[PDB]
Amino acid sequence: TRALDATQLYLNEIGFSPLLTPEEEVHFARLAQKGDPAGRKRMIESNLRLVVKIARRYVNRGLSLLDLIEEGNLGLIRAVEKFDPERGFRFSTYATWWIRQTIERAIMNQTRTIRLPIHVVKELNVYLRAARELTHKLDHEPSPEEIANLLEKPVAEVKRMLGLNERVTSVDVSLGPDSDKTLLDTLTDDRPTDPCELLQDDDLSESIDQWLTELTDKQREVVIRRFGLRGHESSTLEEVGQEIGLTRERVRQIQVEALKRLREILEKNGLSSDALFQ
Amino acid sequence: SDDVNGRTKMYKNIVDGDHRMEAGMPESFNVLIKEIRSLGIDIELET
Amino acid sequence: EFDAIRIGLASPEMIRSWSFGEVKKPETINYRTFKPERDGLFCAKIFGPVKDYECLCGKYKRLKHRGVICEKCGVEVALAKVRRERMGHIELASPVAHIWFLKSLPSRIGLLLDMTLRDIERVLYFESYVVIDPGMTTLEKGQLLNDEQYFEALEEFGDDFDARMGAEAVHELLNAIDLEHEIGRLREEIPQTNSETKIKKLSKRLKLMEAFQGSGNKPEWMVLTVLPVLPPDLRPLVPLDGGRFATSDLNDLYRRVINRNNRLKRLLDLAAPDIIVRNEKRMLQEAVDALLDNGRRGRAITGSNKRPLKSLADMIKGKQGRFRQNLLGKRVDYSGRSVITVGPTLRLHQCGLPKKMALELFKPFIFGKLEGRGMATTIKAAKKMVERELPEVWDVLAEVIREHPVLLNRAPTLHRLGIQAFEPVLIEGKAIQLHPLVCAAYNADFDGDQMAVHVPLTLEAQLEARALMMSTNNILSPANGEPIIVPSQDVVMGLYYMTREAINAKGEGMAFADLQEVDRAYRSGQASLHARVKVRINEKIKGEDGQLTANTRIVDTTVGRALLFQVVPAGLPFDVVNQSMKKKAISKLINHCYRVVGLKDTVIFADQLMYTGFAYSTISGVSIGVNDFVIPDEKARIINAATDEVKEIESQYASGLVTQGEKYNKVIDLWSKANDEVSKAMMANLSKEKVVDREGKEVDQESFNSMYMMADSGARGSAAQIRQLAGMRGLMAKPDGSIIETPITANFREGLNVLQYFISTHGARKGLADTALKTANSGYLTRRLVDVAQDLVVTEIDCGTEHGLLMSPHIEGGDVVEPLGERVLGRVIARDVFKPGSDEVIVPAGTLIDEKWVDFLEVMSVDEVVVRSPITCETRHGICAMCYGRDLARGHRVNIGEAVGVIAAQSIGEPGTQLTAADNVQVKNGGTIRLHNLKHVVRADGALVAVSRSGELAVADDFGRERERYKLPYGAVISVKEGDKVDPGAIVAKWDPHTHPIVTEVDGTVAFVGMEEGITVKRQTDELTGLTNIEVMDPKDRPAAGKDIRPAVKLIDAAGKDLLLPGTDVPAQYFLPANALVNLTDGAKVSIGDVVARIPQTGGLPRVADLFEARRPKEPSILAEISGTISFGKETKGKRRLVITPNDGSDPYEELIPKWRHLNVFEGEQVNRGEVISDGPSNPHDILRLLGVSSLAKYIVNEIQDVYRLQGVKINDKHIETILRQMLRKVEVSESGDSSFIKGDQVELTQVLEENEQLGTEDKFPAKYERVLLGITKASLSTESFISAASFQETTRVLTEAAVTGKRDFLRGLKENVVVGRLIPAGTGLAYHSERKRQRDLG
Ligand SMILES: [Mg+2]
Ligand SMILES: [Zn+2]
Ligand SMILES: [Zn+2]
């Protein structure tokens, strides 16, 4: 029975690598520029001992140990493909900027559950660093209006920027010493979920269309044209009057007459609109 | 309890006056089907 | 509808059919706007729209088009419920291995690939290589490779060497498995190896390799490439107060895989080296491993926290503790709880209900009545009428409360009587007005208890709640025949004072015309409540069916007894009310009234008896005071006398002539003996605490004290609680296990001291610690019996066989405990019972026994009858209605469809919370001597010595079997002869309990052969020639030469010829055991019956739960394997060898007996298979194998019920034997031909195959079976269903076995339809499942 691990197996695989001297990397980088299959394999495998120390520097972050080392390897493959041997730059110094660039991109795009754009995530990096120094400088809690005066920013701008970091927490994790019920059984819906509320909207819809068919004949088609209660589309006064009535004031005179008639029906029926709207 | 269409259709039967007692389907078992099929194990109804 | 829920493998071609889109982007919602994005975990194109009938961009939002796809955004308009049905899929670039088939206890991949457990993870982690399809090479697919082994083998062979590593190697081995040809290699190498360890691993491989062929599941489907995702509504994203969201932990696991799956496709499109590819493939394996389960080896930690994330498989385990949501507590509507309140003005079928609760429970019923009447037009206007509290809403409310049985239940439900239906009555207040008599069934007192309510909506539920759940129907307890609706302490107090006898009273000696004159003379103030008068009544007897005769009898009873007869109906005589009407005397009257009259006249009689019990209890102002606790004047004489006797023991201990262990037992019994004298002097003074006079000087009668009436009537308390108030409390024992020597002389009236009260806190605090723990142990016992007895619903009316065990009353001790009228009450007769005469039959057909046939058996002297029990039935998957008894809530027989398996498990677990020398024998009742199964030799002097230990000396009465029955040990002296006259108090047997005698065969001389002077025998004497015998040596203290030597005293004649015993060829020679002494020397004539040598020699819940588990005890009892002569083998091997030499056929093997425990077996004695050899408890497994199947049911009933008998609870035997049927269901096999050698198959599967092979091609294919005993926890694991097995067992253990097998399981049973949600076949649901099965491929 041998030890089974993930981070331990990768550390032993990179240990069996040859040393990279300065007199040999100049020839390997020269052959990789022309294009060869053996040039990309020997150059990428010799620099595997460098990304392990750079990815381990960003400890206690959103990404794990294997997530930082694997993401840093993509920057090394792109560095050896865009290196300029004629410029005289060091092969190890040119790949350091590409290894550090790919690490910072994965933190601002894979740590939070909501992906933020790049042009707005850089503004929150300087706000967290400014709040860290001001935390120990004042020996108090970091106030939202205190950072606005130090950084010369309005109060309405700092309130939205500092409030963008929601720091969402889990739901299945229950609070308290005893885990008797999680947060899934304490939430409710915003729409109508009760059987009584779903029946009032259905019974009222079947009565509104029924009251219009029994109210009148000529006045029923005018209210249905203004408001699409029978499935028709809503139209304006000028659009509805252009095909019926041939006027803009004839369609409004019948509307007020039919409105006063339906007002008396709901009063004698028992709807009690004076008590509902109050 | 544990229904969507059964509770709404039963409330109309009480107001109408006749208890039809629709069958419906419990919501405690419909969630278990979606959680089992997402684990790589198949489940179906032969009927 | 649907049926036959099956489980199979998720094929990669089938997963694509369930999904509707491919999830590629990990982001879900935009930062600025709160809208999902395409190809996300919450996308609208893949799963569905967010709102009702609206797309994402808002182009199509009308309610006309039901199904349409927008041209701007590819989303189909639908409702909000479609988002819970549609799922997605993630197409991985590289395959990943499933973890459910790797880290489980049975390695489904290890035995299929012929690899080890640690080898599966060694290849998947890219550590070691493996070659596939080697062909004609030195290595094969079973061998492994390494870093240096793979490089050397490539340059050696070069060709025909295909090696892979990772998830592709296991997928390549599972593809070309060739299960059609691989089964031939297992069926040919199975009988070749005779090793038990090699045939066990090969039998498990054939059991699983054949499941993939019949079910159609390919072994390559265990590994997966594309995996489905959960619907987004099960992991919702709901905002909170302040713009903060709430993300589920299951979404984090899905986002981690997509972040690594996209990197794998990008890295493989640039010709990356093989070193960096293995690093990404190992991360994808851990990502999928952490998505299914979590906490075992991965233990992924989330951000800003330390608890591990709950995955999909962890969500099922975390769902109410590895259970389903249907099996746990479910929130239901139309309910409500409040404080209960007693109401004496309510009927037995109705209860009380507040007005404010009835408006909220019956809210949907008011809206339907207002619209049909015409007061409310729409449903919105009716809502404002019930919330305004108008004067017309109360008149329409009472219209639906008249006939609407509502349900009532308490928090703890331990029996079926906990949920009863009542008729609600609109009362004013905020409490539930409950009936006083029904409180005995709920077992609830009025101290702040809450009872929930339930309102059935469907009229189908209102009919089954009135005919079954009504309080008038369940008047009899389901445990025994005693009614559960009995007058309580308050009702029995008013009835006991009404029926009382007095010497002198006002109005004594007069006469009355009828019962109408007694009530008028009493209420007028001229007659006492209890006075000796004479009245003439017109009573009617219902002895004839359909005829009610009328008779006039002039009886002389009290005044109160004549008033109680008015409540009694005209179906009972006047003798039933002539007693004192105690609690136990009135529980038998209701049981007799319901049996001879009916149910309609019994409910009205139970209500009028409660009305006359409360009215007469208020007239007699009984009250307890300081003068009622009559302290006996002779109590100080016993305490002062015992105080002088204990000082004498302490005066002796100061010198030292008595040890500490002797004085402790000699003083703890003095206070126990003195406690009886105090209680005897108190009961003699409390009962005669009345002095009256009637034309005389002095006359004594029963006392009218308030404390005596509350103790003799059995209302509250017993005789053990009155001793703590009048006399001393006794010896308060410490909770450590020892009893405290210093007693408490003071009582509750005189006041306790400071040190005397501190001792009382020890037993009082230990009693409360066991009360809270009694609810967890009794609740756990009833939770295991219902899980094994859940599929035992009655389905057949009668089998047609005659197989039952004998029923005999308890003849133990001096008198009988339970007569035959109670054990055969309500049971059918198996065979035709015969008269004890020459040849006469009583029951010509053997029908059921009602209350009339019980007294009929008392006329004759019948004592042994056979009944059909459910433990010896013949049906398949059920229990016949004729084989079951009739002890139910009703008086008739059982019904077809009643779940008798659940009502039998609740009757045992309900009273669980109430649970925790002989040298000469004599007789009590004079009678004849009836011997059975015993053989002895009569001596010429008059004695009788029996050499058998199975002799039972039973006393017979003048008409048959008496109430006395004893057992005769081996080597006992019985001076009385068999078949003699009666003798009261005489001695019939005498033996030594310590010294074990050795029986002799015949008379003559004796010659000791095989005795070693120094190793085997050592002549030792005592002081002044105290003991001069032939003492043998010990087995361990012997030398090396006499280690295996064993002496044997041969019995021969005095003339010199060898003597032998008849029956056997070898003579009966007595052996010489260790620490034995020969009374007679060698060469002397010894008579028969003389001792050859001298060989000297917890209750409650832990006892009942241990017998149902059938666990092997620490010290079992070793029984004989077959009858025959017993002898000793070789004792030099460290253990004793016991061999049996029968007369018909001997056995080559011999059982080994250990030397740790004693052995009461004697050499040369005819042993049998019935009695035991070693002392101590007997294991239940040895009774079923050696004694029989009918004897095991008798031993369990006589042992489990004995624990309940010490407390006083009455449980019928039909419920104990019902659980025994399920434990004896599975049987073993000892002959091959159809299955393996050792397999546990049910008796229903073996009977359908044994009777089928008799009519076919080959009749010898059938094999025999043997019954085996299983515990209540082991028999519950044989459930064919997976939804009923995943409740108590592990979820990942049942689903994994059901997947690789592909067993299509049906919904038959009771526990299956609860999780699914269909009707239950038990009860009224039997007609639904019968019509469903009839119209299914049958016509
Ligand atoms: Mg209580
Ligand atoms: Zn759209
Ligand atoms: Zn049967």
From Swiss-Prot, chain A:
Motif Interaction with polymerase core subunit RpoC, residue range(s) on this chain: 67-70
Stretches the record annotates as Sigma-70 factor domain-2: 43-113
Positions of the UniProt region annotated as Sigma-70 factor domain-3: 123-198
Region (Sigma-70 factor domain-1): 5-38
Keyword Transcription appears in the UniProt entry: yes
Cell compartment(s), UniProt: Cytoplasm
UniProt main location, coarse: cytoplasm
DNA-binding region: 237-256
Function: Sigma factors are initiation factors that promote the attachment of RNA polymerase to specific initiation sites and are then released. This sigma factor is the master transcriptional regulator of the stationary phase and the general stress response.
Subunit description: Interacts with the RNA polymerase core enzyme.
Family (UniProt): Belongs to the sigma-70 factor family. RpoS subfamily.
Protein name, entry field: RNA polymerase sigma factor RpoS
Organism: Pseudomonas aeruginosa (strain ATCC 15692 / DSM 22644 / CIP 104116 / JCM 14847 / LMG 12228 / 1C / PRS 101 / PAO1)
Lineage: Bacteria, Pseudomonadati, Pseudomonadota, Gammaproteobacteria, Pseudomonadales
UniProtKB/Swiss-Prot annotation, chain B:
Segments forming a coiled coil: none
Protein origin, superkingdom: Bacteria
Function comment: DNA-dependent RNA polymerase catalyzes the transcription of DNA into RNA using the four ribonucleoside triphosphates as substrates.
Family: Belongs to the RNA polymerase beta chain family.
Subunit structure: The RNAP catalytic core consists of 2 alpha, 1 beta, 1 beta' and 1 omega subunit. When a sigma factor is associated with the core the holoenzyme is formed, which can initiate transcription.
Protein name as annotated: DNA-directed RNA polymerase subunit beta
From Swiss-Prot, chain C:
E.C. no: 2.7.7.6
Entry keywords, A to Z: DNA-directed RNA polymerase, Magnesium, Metal-binding, Nucleotidyltransferase, Transcription, Transferase, Zinc
Pfam families xref list: RNA_pol_Rpb1_1, RNA_pol_Rpb1_2, RNA_pol_Rpb1_3, RNA_pol_Rpb1_4, RNA_pol_Rpb1_5
First-tier enzyme category under EC: transferase
GO molecular function: DNA binding; DNA-directed RNA polymerase activity; magnesium ion binding; zinc ion binding
UniProt cross-references to HAMAP family, sorted A to Z: RNApol_bact_RpoC
Organism classification: Bacteria, Pseudomonadati, Pseudomonadota, Gammaproteobacteria, Pseudomonadales
GO cellular component: DNA-directed RNA polymerase complex
Family (UniProt): Belongs to the RNA polymerase beta' chain family.
Chain residues that bind Zn(2+) 2: C799, C873, C880, C883
Binding site for Zn(2+) 1: C55, C57, C70, C73
Subunit details: The RNAP catalytic core consists of 2 alpha, 1 beta, 1 beta' and 1 omega subunit. When a sigma factor is associated with the core the holoenzyme is formed, which can initiate transcription.
Function, in words: DNA-dependent RNA polymerase catalyzes the transcription of DNA into RNA using the four ribonucleoside triphosphates as substrates.
GO biological process entries: DNA-templated transcription
Residues that hold Mg(2+) according to the record: D445, D447, D449
Protein name: DNA-directed RNA polymerase subunit beta'
Co-factor: note: Binds 1 Mg(2+) ion per subunit.
Keyword Transmembrane helix attached: no
Catalytic activity: RNA(n) + a ribonucleoside 5'-triphosphate = RNA(n+1) + diphosphate
Coiled coil region boundaries: none
